[PDB]
Amino acid sequence: EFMRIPCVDAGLISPLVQLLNSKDQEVLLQTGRALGNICYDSHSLQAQLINMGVIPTLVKLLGIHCQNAALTEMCLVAFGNLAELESSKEQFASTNIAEELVKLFKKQIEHDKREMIFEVLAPLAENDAIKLQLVEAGLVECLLEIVQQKVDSDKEDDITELKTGSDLMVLLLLGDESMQKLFEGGKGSVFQRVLSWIPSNNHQLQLAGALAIANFARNDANCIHMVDNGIVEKLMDLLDRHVEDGNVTVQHAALSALRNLAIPVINKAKMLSAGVTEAVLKFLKSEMPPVQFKLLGTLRMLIDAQAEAAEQLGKNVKLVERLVEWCEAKDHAGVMGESNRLLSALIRHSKSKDVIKTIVQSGGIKHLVTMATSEHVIMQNEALVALALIAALELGTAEKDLESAKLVQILHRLPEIKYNSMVLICALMGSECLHKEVQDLAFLDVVSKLRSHENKSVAQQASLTEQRLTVES
């Protein structure tokens, strides 16, 4: 009888899975290769892969035949293909794969075979439990030894292993549990080694070291510890060495660490006192957007409620002119947005007339005005509050640019907490150039708030805005 033959499916695969428990090594080699070569792209196929327990069965086989190079190699190949599925990694994370791979790795004295294991470790280590399991199984001390063994070596294979090893270490630091384990309250081997990597001449170790700090610096307690222990000084020294003709990769990582470190309130004053601003502004002339992005982010974290710092930066005319420049960089959204946010924050946290004037003289108003129409609500009322401060402090010097930028027209079209637009209008009300107000038909909208807006905040200010817009204009 004529048979319909479907695409590869459970019927083809089921038989092969049953063979995984054979004591014949040829059979195991045939079936294992076959199973690792099949593409589990269908959802029913991966379901079958998971439900028939192929992954745990292969990890088991790797345990039993880790002395057989043919079987071991086939498992590694199989694992490399299987590992690429997120659902598969989850399953790997309930097995002994981490320990089995480290034991195996420790046994190897051939670069090629090490590399085979690296290519299984890397995808698997995207899973956070696997990361933690690798740390517990001793992977990092292997990695650190490899780096130490290969620093200062020009052998192609030495630099490649140092690279792959140091990168894998960083990957381990992206998982929260693995990272914290390695941090070990600020005395962990990795943290302390990295203090020797950052001041070194090896760019890959500078890079890996700076990234290790960045990834350690992902909660308050770690950041506070590292700042109390002088990490900011080493990162500034690292940055200084890369001002002139630097590696952008290392500049970015270093600035990324500083940005993370500046997040805790307690850190901000300490970093400012250490002179971190001066180190970071040496990269204003960078044309590399990632560097720009992270230098901007760092400054913004550092001024977060630090008025003296916001004031010194807001009056730095080179900084401000550069910000206005980067607000016009249309292709690089991150730096555009960070630059806009920095302009706003400079005003909100300093509340200084001098920074406000520096910003108007430099062209900043139109950019703040445009930011108020941002799709992100946080950025809109950051724009508004900054606008309100400039109304209240330097309306005279600004109203020309505020006219040009058509702010009152924008305010009208404006939502929820963007009700702060009403507060801005009432402060703009005392403007010569910005006469209407009235002509804009704002009296039709102002009192019409009442409630709803249902919020007691969004309702109550309507009475104030209605009393003001009725008594005048």
Tab-separated table of C-alpha atoms in Angstrom:
chain	number	residue	atom	x	y	z
A	1	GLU	CA	0.000	0.000	0.000
A	2	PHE	CA	1.131	3.539	-0.808
A	3	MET	CA	2.245	5.509	2.240
A	4	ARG	CA	2.087	9.244	2.954
A	5	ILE	CA	5.483	10.208	4.463
A	6	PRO	CA	5.258	13.353	6.651
A	7	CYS	CA	8.029	15.713	7.662
A	8	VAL	CA	10.283	14.573	10.467
A	9	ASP	CA	8.156	13.856	13.553
A	10	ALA	CA	7.641	11.775	16.730
A	11	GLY	CA	7.341	8.528	14.747
A	12	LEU	CA	10.835	8.914	13.285
A	13	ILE	CA	12.331	10.102	16.582
A	14	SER	CA	10.659	7.791	19.135
A	15	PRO	CA	12.536	4.689	17.859
A	16	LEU	CA	15.876	6.502	18.045
A	17	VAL	CA	15.235	7.622	21.619
A	18	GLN	CA	14.636	4.003	22.698
A	19	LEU	CA	18.170	3.195	21.427
A	20	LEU	CA	19.885	5.655	23.789
A	21	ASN	CA	19.720	2.951	26.500
A	22	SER	CA	21.656	0.386	24.405
A	23	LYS	CA	24.928	-1.083	25.687
A	24	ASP	CA	26.233	-1.253	22.074
A	25	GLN	CA	28.581	1.726	21.558
A	26	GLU	CA	28.078	1.812	17.769
A	27	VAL	CA	24.314	2.004	18.315
A	28	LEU	CA	24.704	4.782	20.904
A	29	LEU	CA	26.965	6.679	18.528
A	30	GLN	CA	24.542	6.320	15.600
A	31	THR	CA	21.426	7.240	17.542
A	32	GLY	CA	23.025	10.051	19.578
A	33	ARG	CA	24.449	11.778	16.499
A	34	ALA	CA	21.102	11.311	14.703
A	35	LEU	CA	19.099	12.807	17.606
A	36	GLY	CA	21.473	15.759	17.984
A	37	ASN	CA	21.308	16.496	14.215
A	38	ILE	CA	17.523	16.689	13.960
A	39	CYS	CA	15.973	20.155	13.955
A	40	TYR	CA	13.415	20.578	16.747
A	41	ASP	CA	11.871	23.725	15.216
A	42	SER	CA	8.316	22.458	15.462
A	43	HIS	CA	6.634	22.871	18.804
A	44	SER	CA	5.450	19.239	18.800
A	45	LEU	CA	9.048	18.107	18.147
A	46	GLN	CA	10.581	19.977	21.081
A	47	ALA	CA	7.622	18.813	23.178
A	48	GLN	CA	8.629	15.259	22.197
A	49	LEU	CA	12.299	15.973	22.866
A	50	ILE	CA	11.414	17.267	26.328
A	51	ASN	CA	8.810	14.622	27.107
A	52	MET	CA	10.979	11.684	26.044
A	53	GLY	CA	13.855	12.946	28.273
A	54	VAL	CA	16.566	12.940	25.605
A	55	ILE	CA	18.602	15.692	27.256
A	56	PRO	CA	18.829	14.027	30.678
A	57	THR	CA	19.516	10.715	28.967
A	58	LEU	CA	22.418	12.240	27.015
A	59	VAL	CA	23.831	13.974	30.077
A	60	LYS	CA	23.695	10.564	31.769
A	61	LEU	CA	25.520	8.957	28.828
A	62	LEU	CA	28.149	11.681	28.963
A	63	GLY	CA	28.699	10.683	32.612
A	64	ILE	CA	29.037	6.975	31.828
A	65	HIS	CA	31.323	7.335	28.762
A	66	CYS	CA	33.329	10.507	29.459
A	67	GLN	CA	36.511	8.395	28.925
A	68	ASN	CA	35.396	7.431	25.389
A	69	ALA	CA	36.375	10.241	22.991
A	70	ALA	CA	33.880	9.177	20.284
A	71	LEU	CA	30.863	9.112	22.625
A	72	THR	CA	32.007	12.222	24.473
A	73	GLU	CA	32.436	14.156	21.225
A	74	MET	CA	29.008	13.097	19.963
A	75	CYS	CA	27.345	14.273	23.228
A	76	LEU	CA	29.089	17.645	22.970
A	77	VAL	CA	27.949	18.076	19.370
A	78	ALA	CA	24.458	16.944	20.320
A	79	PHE	CA	24.465	19.374	23.282
A	80	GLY	CA	25.642	22.286	21.102
A	81	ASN	CA	22.658	21.854	18.788
A	82	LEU	CA	20.188	21.114	21.593
A	83	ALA	CA	21.433	24.013	23.754
A	84	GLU	CA	20.218	26.669	21.317
A	85	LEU	CA	16.548	26.264	22.436
A	86	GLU	CA	15.432	28.196	25.566
A	87	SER	CA	13.191	25.280	26.553
A	88	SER	CA	16.152	22.923	26.220
A	89	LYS	CA	18.364	25.070	28.530
A	90	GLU	CA	15.746	24.897	31.265
A	91	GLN	CA	15.846	21.112	30.986
A	92	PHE	CA	19.697	21.087	31.007
A	93	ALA	CA	19.460	23.094	34.259
A	94	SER	CA	17.844	20.129	36.064
A	95	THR	CA	20.719	17.761	35.155
A	96	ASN	CA	24.404	17.380	36.124
A	97	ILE	CA	25.574	18.908	32.842
A	98	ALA	CA	27.423	21.811	34.541
A	99	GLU	CA	29.549	19.592	36.765
A	100	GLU	CA	30.046	17.032	34.029
A	101	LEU	CA	31.281	19.679	31.591
A	102	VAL	CA	33.702	21.205	34.171
A	103	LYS	CA	35.193	17.798	35.091
A	104	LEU	CA	35.593	17.116	31.404
A	105	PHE	CA	37.066	20.566	30.783
A	106	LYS	CA	39.608	20.125	33.610
A	107	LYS	CA	40.832	16.864	32.002
A	108	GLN	CA	41.668	18.509	28.623
A	109	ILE	CA	45.196	19.427	27.470
A	110	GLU	CA	44.378	20.112	23.784
A	111	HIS	CA	43.155	23.552	22.638
A	112	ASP	CA	40.712	22.053	20.111
A	113	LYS	CA	38.988	19.857	22.683
A	114	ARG	CA	38.827	22.751	25.202
A	115	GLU	CA	37.199	24.819	22.451
A	116	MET	CA	34.618	22.063	21.888
A	117	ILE	CA	33.568	22.331	25.533
A	118	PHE	CA	33.606	26.165	25.448
A	119	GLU	CA	31.101	26.019	22.583
A	120	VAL	CA	28.717	23.985	24.736
A	121	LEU	CA	29.354	26.026	27.917
A	122	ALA	CA	28.585	29.397	26.265
A	123	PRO	CA	25.048	28.783	25.027
A	124	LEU	CA	24.137	26.794	28.174
A	125	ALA	CA	25.407	29.584	30.430
A	126	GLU	CA	22.745	31.924	29.042
A	127	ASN	CA	20.483	30.140	31.511
A	128	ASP	CA	20.907	31.599	35.037
A	129	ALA	CA	20.630	28.307	36.992
A	130	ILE	CA	23.331	26.810	34.713
A	131	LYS	CA	25.522	29.837	35.533
A	132	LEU	CA	25.112	29.221	39.221
A	133	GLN	CA	25.755	25.475	38.750
A	134	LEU	CA	28.928	26.200	36.772
A	135	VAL	CA	30.193	28.465	39.564
A	136	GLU	CA	29.445	25.818	42.140
A	137	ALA	CA	31.193	23.156	40.020
A	138	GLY	CA	34.453	25.221	39.971
A	139	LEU	CA	34.382	26.685	36.453
A	140	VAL	CA	35.632	30.135	37.392
A	141	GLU	CA	38.904	29.010	39.003
A	142	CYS	CA	39.634	27.100	35.745
A	143	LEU	CA	38.858	30.286	33.848
A	144	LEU	CA	41.007	32.510	36.087
A	145	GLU	CA	43.933	30.080	35.869
A	146	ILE	CA	43.635	30.008	32.107
A	147	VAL	CA	43.761	33.811	31.956
A	148	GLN	CA	46.757	34.012	34.312
A	149	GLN	CA	48.467	31.207	32.372
A	150	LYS	CA	47.943	33.088	29.075
A	151	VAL	CA	48.391	36.772	29.911
A	152	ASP	CA	51.477	38.227	28.139
A	153	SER	CA	51.440	35.387	25.548
A	154	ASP	CA	51.429	36.089	21.802
A	155	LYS	CA	50.494	32.509	20.792
A	156	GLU	CA	47.297	32.758	18.740
A	157	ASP	CA	45.683	29.968	20.724
A	158	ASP	CA	46.701	31.538	24.068
A	159	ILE	CA	45.087	34.873	23.226
A	160	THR	CA	41.956	33.122	21.901
A	161	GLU	CA	41.602	31.053	25.115
A	162	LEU	CA	42.237	34.115	27.323
A	163	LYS	CA	39.524	35.875	25.334
A	164	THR	CA	36.944	33.068	25.444
A	165	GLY	CA	37.685	32.405	29.125
A	166	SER	CA	37.460	36.032	30.247
A	167	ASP	CA	34.231	36.551	28.212
A	168	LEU	CA	32.614	33.466	29.698
A	169	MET	CA	33.443	34.871	33.154
A	170	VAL	CA	31.563	38.050	32.293
A	171	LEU	CA	28.570	35.959	31.075
A	172	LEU	CA	28.473	34.295	34.528
A	173	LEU	CA	28.168	37.754	36.012
A	174	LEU	CA	24.935	38.543	34.074
A	175	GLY	CA	22.976	36.071	36.248
A	176	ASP	CA	21.951	37.476	39.629
A	177	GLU	CA	22.641	34.424	41.735
A	178	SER	CA	25.956	33.500	40.006
A	179	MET	CA	27.109	37.122	40.146
A	180	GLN	CA	26.342	37.424	43.876
A	181	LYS	CA	28.022	34.147	44.678
A	182	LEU	CA	31.174	35.363	42.865
A	183	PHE	CA	30.964	38.784	44.515
A	184	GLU	CA	30.993	37.124	47.925
A	185	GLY	CA	30.382	40.332	49.866
A	186	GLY	CA	33.223	42.156	48.073
A	187	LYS	CA	35.993	39.734	48.871
A	188	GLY	CA	35.342	37.144	46.134
A	189	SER	CA	38.283	35.864	44.022
A	190	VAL	CA	36.836	37.328	40.833
A	191	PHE	CA	36.302	40.768	42.267
A	192	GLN	CA	39.827	40.795	43.699
A	193	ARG	CA	41.433	39.417	40.479
A	194	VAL	CA	39.640	42.061	38.436
A	195	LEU	CA	41.357	44.715	40.532
A	196	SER	CA	44.560	43.459	38.895
A	197	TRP	CA	42.970	43.218	35.397
A	198	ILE	CA	41.755	46.804	35.281
A	199	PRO	CA	45.202	48.393	35.802
A	200	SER	CA	46.862	45.892	33.394
A	201	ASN	CA	48.111	46.515	29.829
A	202	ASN	CA	46.012	43.756	28.332
A	203	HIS	CA	43.023	45.418	26.690
A	204	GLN	CA	40.875	42.256	26.850
A	205	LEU	CA	41.422	42.076	30.628
A	206	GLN	CA	40.793	45.774	31.013
A	207	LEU	CA	37.585	45.173	29.102
A	208	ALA	CA	36.621	42.055	31.038
A	209	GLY	CA	37.571	43.673	34.340
A	210	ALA	CA	35.499	46.806	33.721
A	211	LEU	CA	32.534	44.668	32.601
A	212	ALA	CA	32.948	42.510	35.720
A	213	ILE	CA	32.628	45.612	37.864
A	214	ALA	CA	29.653	46.851	35.829
A	215	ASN	CA	27.880	43.544	36.354
A	216	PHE	CA	28.788	43.321	40.012
A	217	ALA	CA	27.266	46.784	40.338
A	218	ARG	CA	23.671	45.703	39.876
A	219	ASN	CA	22.317	46.222	43.403
A	220	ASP	CA	22.829	48.918	46.037
A	221	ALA	CA	24.852	46.864	48.506
A	222	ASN	CA	27.420	45.739	45.870
A	223	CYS	CA	27.760	49.267	44.474
A	224	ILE	CA	28.215	50.806	47.915
A	225	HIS	CA	30.834	48.246	48.812
A	226	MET	CA	32.811	48.761	45.586
A	227	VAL	CA	32.713	52.529	45.868
A	228	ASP	CA	33.777	52.393	49.554
A	229	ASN	CA	36.669	50.194	48.399
A	230	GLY	CA	38.032	52.634	45.819
A	231	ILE	CA	36.803	51.012	42.592
A	232	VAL	CA	35.921	54.409	41.125
A	233	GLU	CA	39.650	55.448	41.274
A	234	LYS	CA	40.767	52.422	39.290
A	235	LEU	CA	38.055	53.006	36.685
A	236	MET	CA	39.026	56.677	36.328
A	237	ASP	CA	42.690	55.606	35.905
A	238	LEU	CA	41.545	53.108	33.295
A	239	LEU	CA	39.558	55.775	31.485
A	240	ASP	CA	42.493	58.238	31.553
A	241	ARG	CA	44.697	55.742	29.719
A	242	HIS	CA	42.059	55.545	26.966
A	243	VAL	CA	41.399	59.275	26.473
A	244	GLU	CA	43.977	59.888	23.729
A	245	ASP	CA	43.701	56.938	21.270
A	246	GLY	CA	41.589	54.538	23.217
A	247	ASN	CA	39.777	51.298	22.834
A	248	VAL	CA	36.054	52.131	22.537
A	249	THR	CA	35.115	48.767	23.888
A	250	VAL	CA	37.034	49.531	27.122
A	251	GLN	CA	35.787	53.132	27.337
A	252	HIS	CA	32.208	51.867	27.057
A	253	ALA	CA	32.612	49.146	29.691
A	254	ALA	CA	34.329	51.539	32.135
A	255	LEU	CA	31.658	54.200	31.637
A	256	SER	CA	28.969	51.481	31.930
A	257	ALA	CA	30.393	50.477	35.330
A	258	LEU	CA	30.489	54.099	36.519
A	259	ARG	CA	26.881	54.546	35.439
A	260	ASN	CA	25.775	51.514	37.486
A	261	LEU	CA	27.898	52.598	40.471
A	262	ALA	CA	26.403	56.109	40.526
A	263	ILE	CA	22.847	54.826	40.997
A	264	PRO	CA	22.770	54.487	44.819
A	265	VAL	CA	22.109	57.832	46.558
A	266	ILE	CA	25.000	57.203	48.965
A	267	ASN	CA	27.396	56.691	46.012
A	268	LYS	CA	26.686	59.987	44.226
A	269	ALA	CA	28.475	62.401	46.597
A	270	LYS	CA	31.444	60.050	46.991
A	271	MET	CA	31.861	59.715	43.235
A	272	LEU	CA	31.470	63.456	42.757
A	273	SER	CA	34.116	64.095	45.451
A	274	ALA	CA	36.486	61.616	43.856
A	275	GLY	CA	36.328	63.842	40.720
A	276	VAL	CA	34.515	61.374	38.480
A	277	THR	CA	32.958	64.228	36.448
A	278	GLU	CA	36.378	65.347	35.252
A	279	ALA	CA	37.257	61.829	34.077
A	280	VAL	CA	33.986	61.336	32.233
A	281	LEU	CA	33.967	64.713	30.413
A	282	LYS	CA	37.233	63.788	28.703
A	283	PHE	CA	34.934	61.696	26.442
A	284	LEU	CA	32.657	64.549	25.291
A	285	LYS	CA	34.679	64.486	22.057
A	286	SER	CA	33.850	60.801	21.490
A	287	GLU	CA	31.877	60.186	18.295
A	288	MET	CA	31.052	56.640	19.389
A	289	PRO	CA	27.389	56.641	20.412
A	290	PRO	CA	27.690	53.850	22.983
A	291	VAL	CA	30.399	55.866	24.742
A	292	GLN	CA	28.297	59.016	24.476
A	293	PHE	CA	25.260	57.156	25.747
A	294	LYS	CA	27.008	55.867	28.856
A	295	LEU	CA	28.887	59.071	29.615
A	296	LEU	CA	25.524	60.878	29.472
A	297	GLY	CA	23.853	58.263	31.669
A	298	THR	CA	26.672	58.468	34.189
A	299	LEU	CA	26.392	62.268	34.480
A	300	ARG	CA	22.634	62.028	34.844
A	301	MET	CA	22.846	59.489	37.654
A	302	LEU	CA	25.472	61.596	39.370
A	303	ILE	CA	23.383	64.790	39.507
A	304	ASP	CA	20.150	62.965	40.480
A	305	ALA	CA	19.503	65.050	43.607
A	306	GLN	CA	22.924	66.637	43.858
A	307	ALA	CA	22.295	70.377	43.335
A	308	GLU	CA	25.903	71.517	43.687
A	309	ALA	CA	26.938	68.939	41.061
A	310	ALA	CA	24.023	69.773	38.751
A	311	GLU	CA	25.089	73.426	39.080
A	312	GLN	CA	28.763	72.928	38.200
A	313	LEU	CA	27.788	70.783	35.163
A	314	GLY	CA	24.929	72.985	34.036
A	315	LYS	CA	27.316	75.951	33.831
A	316	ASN	CA	29.954	73.948	31.970
A	317	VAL	CA	29.388	75.518	28.572
A	318	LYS	CA	31.325	72.892	26.599
A	319	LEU	CA	29.171	70.184	28.211
A	320	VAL	CA	25.947	72.030	27.484
A	321	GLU	CA	26.843	72.902	23.873
A	322	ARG	CA	27.759	69.266	23.334
A	323	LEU	CA	24.386	68.225	24.791
A	324	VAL	CA	22.503	70.484	22.447
A	325	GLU	CA	24.573	69.053	19.587
A	326	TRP	CA	23.635	65.486	20.639
A	327	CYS	CA	19.951	66.391	20.985
A	328	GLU	CA	20.184	66.910	17.171
A	329	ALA	CA	21.772	63.473	16.476
A	330	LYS	CA	18.723	61.935	14.814
A	331	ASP	CA	20.150	58.455	14.042
A	332	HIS	CA	21.174	57.660	17.615
A	333	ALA	CA	18.009	57.493	19.690
A	334	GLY	CA	19.635	56.483	22.981
A	335	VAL	CA	22.045	59.435	23.022
A	336	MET	CA	19.357	61.843	21.797
A	337	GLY	CA	17.074	60.764	24.657
A	338	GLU	CA	19.827	60.696	27.298
A	339	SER	CA	21.060	64.095	26.175
A	340	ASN	CA	17.507	65.538	26.432
A	341	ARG	CA	17.048	63.981	29.867
A	342	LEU	CA	20.385	65.369	31.030
A	343	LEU	CA	19.389	68.902	29.931
A	344	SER	CA	16.155	68.626	31.885
A	345	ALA	CA	17.766	67.082	34.975
A	346	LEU	CA	20.470	69.723	35.018
A	347	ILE	CA	17.673	72.258	35.586
A	348	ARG	CA	15.478	70.255	37.918
A	349	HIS	CA	18.235	69.312	40.411
A	350	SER	CA	20.292	72.535	40.272
A	351	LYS	CA	17.298	74.918	40.116
A	352	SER	CA	19.980	77.484	39.229
A	353	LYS	CA	19.504	80.549	37.021
A	354	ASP	CA	23.068	80.279	35.786
A	355	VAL	CA	22.547	76.750	34.388
A	356	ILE	CA	19.243	77.816	32.897
A	357	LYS	CA	20.927	80.745	31.149
A	358	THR	CA	23.767	78.553	29.940
A	359	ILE	CA	21.139	76.231	28.474
A	360	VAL	CA	19.131	79.007	26.701
A	361	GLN	CA	22.283	80.653	25.316
A	362	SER	CA	23.357	77.221	23.987
A	363	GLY	CA	20.017	76.437	22.221
A	364	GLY	CA	18.464	74.075	24.744
A	365	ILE	CA	14.884	75.370	24.921
A	366	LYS	CA	13.591	73.885	21.634
A	367	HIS	CA	14.965	70.505	22.655
A	368	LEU	CA	13.289	70.617	26.084
A	369	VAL	CA	10.085	71.796	24.379
A	370	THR	CA	10.188	68.885	21.905
A	371	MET	CA	10.889	66.438	24.776
A	372	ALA	CA	7.538	67.424	26.334
A	373	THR	CA	5.857	65.668	23.363
A	374	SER	CA	7.853	62.454	24.000
A	375	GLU	CA	6.044	59.101	23.836
A	376	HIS	CA	7.534	58.271	27.254
A	377	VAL	CA	5.476	59.959	29.954
A	378	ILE	CA	8.405	60.156	32.371
A	379	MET	CA	10.358	62.219	29.856
A	380	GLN	CA	7.364	64.504	29.141
A	381	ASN	CA	6.891	65.792	32.689
A	382	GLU	CA	10.666	65.863	33.195
A	383	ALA	CA	10.477	68.281	30.293
A	384	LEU	CA	7.519	70.092	31.891
A	385	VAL	CA	9.006	70.445	35.364
A	386	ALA	CA	12.226	71.796	33.785
A	387	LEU	CA	10.082	74.156	31.727
A	388	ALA	CA	8.210	75.258	34.872
A	389	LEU	CA	11.505	75.964	36.643
A	390	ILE	CA	12.726	78.045	33.708
A	391	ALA	CA	9.401	79.936	33.669
A	392	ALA	CA	9.678	80.655	37.389
A	393	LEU	CA	13.372	81.600	37.307
A	394	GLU	CA	14.298	83.088	33.909
A	395	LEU	CA	11.110	83.635	31.901
A	396	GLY	CA	12.485	86.965	30.681
A	397	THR	CA	15.541	85.465	29.005
A	398	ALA	CA	13.665	82.405	27.634
A	399	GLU	CA	10.314	83.623	26.267
A	400	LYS	CA	11.868	84.335	22.841
A	401	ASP	CA	12.875	80.664	22.384
A	402	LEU	CA	9.666	79.482	24.079
A	403	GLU	CA	7.736	81.460	21.479
A	404	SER	CA	9.754	79.996	18.586
A	405	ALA	CA	9.129	76.486	19.937
A	406	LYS	CA	5.314	76.978	20.136
A	407	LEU	CA	5.094	75.680	23.716
A	408	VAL	CA	1.607	77.001	24.600
A	409	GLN	CA	0.250	75.308	21.470
A	410	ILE	CA	1.826	72.031	22.648
A	411	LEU	CA	0.563	72.519	26.215
A	412	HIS	CA	-2.985	72.827	24.846
A	413	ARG	CA	-3.037	69.562	22.883
A	414	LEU	CA	-1.970	67.925	26.168
A	415	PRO	CA	-2.352	62.180	29.598
A	416	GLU	CA	-2.788	61.618	33.376
A	417	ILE	CA	0.020	63.343	35.389
A	418	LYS	CA	0.854	65.573	32.374
A	419	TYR	CA	-1.726	67.780	34.137
A	420	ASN	CA	1.535	69.510	35.252
A	421	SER	CA	1.116	71.280	31.884
A	422	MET	CA	-1.523	73.414	33.661
A	423	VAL	CA	1.011	74.490	36.286
A	424	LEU	CA	3.429	75.426	33.474
A	425	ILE	CA	0.784	77.565	31.724
A	426	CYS	CA	0.026	79.541	34.911
A	427	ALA	CA	3.764	80.305	35.280
A	428	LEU	CA	3.986	81.233	31.583
A	429	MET	CA	0.957	83.532	32.129
A	430	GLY	CA	3.284	86.399	33.189
A	431	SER	CA	4.947	86.677	29.745
A	432	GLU	CA	5.021	89.621	27.335
A	433	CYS	CA	5.744	87.691	24.106
A	434	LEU	CA	3.660	84.696	25.229
A	435	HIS	CA	0.495	86.813	25.475
A	436	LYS	CA	-2.149	84.165	24.750
A	437	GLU	CA	-2.949	82.078	26.798
A	438	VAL	CA	-6.422	83.561	26.036
A	439	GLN	CA	-6.279	83.355	22.198
A	440	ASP	CA	-5.280	79.663	22.565
A	441	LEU	CA	-8.815	78.893	23.886
A	442	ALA	CA	-7.326	77.490	27.107
A	443	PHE	CA	-10.281	78.770	29.178
A	444	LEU	CA	-12.474	76.266	27.281
A	445	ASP	CA	-10.175	73.424	28.411
A	446	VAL	CA	-8.975	74.634	31.850
A	447	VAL	CA	-12.226	74.773	33.858
A	448	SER	CA	-13.573	71.866	31.769
A	449	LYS	CA	-11.168	69.656	33.744
A	450	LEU	CA	-13.189	69.790	36.987
A	451	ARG	CA	-13.671	66.029	37.580
A	452	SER	CA	-13.001	63.824	35.754
A	453	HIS	CA	-10.028	64.028	35.555
A	454	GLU	CA	-11.054	61.826	38.486
A	455	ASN	CA	-7.830	62.223	40.510
A	456	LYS	CA	-8.007	64.664	43.443
A	457	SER	CA	-4.733	66.109	42.137
A	458	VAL	CA	-5.864	66.338	38.487
A	459	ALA	CA	-9.207	67.785	39.646
A	460	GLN	CA	-8.176	70.327	42.312
A	461	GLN	CA	-5.679	72.300	40.174
A	462	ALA	CA	-8.492	72.967	37.670
A	463	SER	CA	-10.101	75.329	40.210
A	464	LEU	CA	-6.775	77.185	40.531
A	465	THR	CA	-6.193	77.146	36.761
A	466	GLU	CA	-9.834	78.243	36.240
A	467	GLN	CA	-9.589	81.064	38.818
A	468	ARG	CA	-6.371	82.307	37.175
A	469	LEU	CA	-7.541	81.968	33.553
A	470	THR	CA	-10.880	83.641	34.440
A	471	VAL	CA	-9.490	86.522	36.541
A	472	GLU	CA	-6.981	87.265	33.739
A	473	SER	CA	-6.708	86.309	30.037
